[PDB]
């Protein structure tokens, strides 16, 4: 187990570009859209639907069609500086509140 990168510097600069990320997927059979994933800073590992964020290093799996890449990114890797850059702290807050509230019900 590795800690999430919370610095302003990407953990995997090889995957810093959208096109670089998109190449990793190949033919992608999974319920969640590869371009959507690549935009949320994810690249494929080639092991089921395992993705890793290029910046935080944060890893996700088992994508249900209801699950959103940016939402999941914020859920599991709230300290990601890439996430904060693209989405903003107001978005991130909303998502946390929504998830933390989802539990109540």
Ligand X SMILES: C[C@@H]1CN(CC(=O)N2CC(C)(C)c3ncc(Cc4ccc(F)cc4)cc32)[C@@H](CN2CCOC[C@H]2C)C[NH2+]1
Which of 23, 26, 22 has the alpha carbon at shortest distance from 41?
22
104 is in an annotated binding site: no
Residues 6+ apart with CB under 8 A from 82: 10, 41, 53, 54, 55, 56
x/- map, 38-77, Zn ion, by CB under 5 A: ---------------x-xx-x------------------x
Instruction: Select from 17-25, 35-43, 57-65, 79-87 the region that touches ligand X (CB under 6 A).
Output: 57-65
73 is in an annotated binding site: yes
Alpha helices, DSSP H, located in 1-105: 18-25, 34-39, 69-76, 81-87, 89-104
Instruction: Select from 14-22, 33-41, 44-52, 79-87 the region that touches ligand X (CB under 6 A).
Output: 44-52
* Binding-site residues: 53, 56, 73, 80
Residues at the contact surface with ligand X, assessed by CB under 6 A? 45, 50, 52, 59-64, 67, 72, 76
């Amino acid at each position: 187990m590795n800690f999430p990168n919370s610095t302003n510097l990407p953990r995997n600069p090889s995957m810093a570009d959208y096109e670089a990320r998109i190449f990793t997927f190949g033919t992608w059979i999974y319920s969640v859209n590869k371009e959507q994933l690549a935009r949320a800073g994810f690249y494929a590992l080639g092991e089921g639907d395992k993705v890793k964020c290029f910046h935080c290093g944060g890893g996700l799996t088992d994508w249900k069609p209801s699950e959103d890449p940016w939402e999941q990114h914020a859920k599991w890797y709230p300290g990601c500086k890439y996430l904060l850059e693209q989405k903003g702290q107001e978005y991130i807050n909303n998502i946390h509140l929504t998830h933390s509230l989802e539990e109540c019900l």
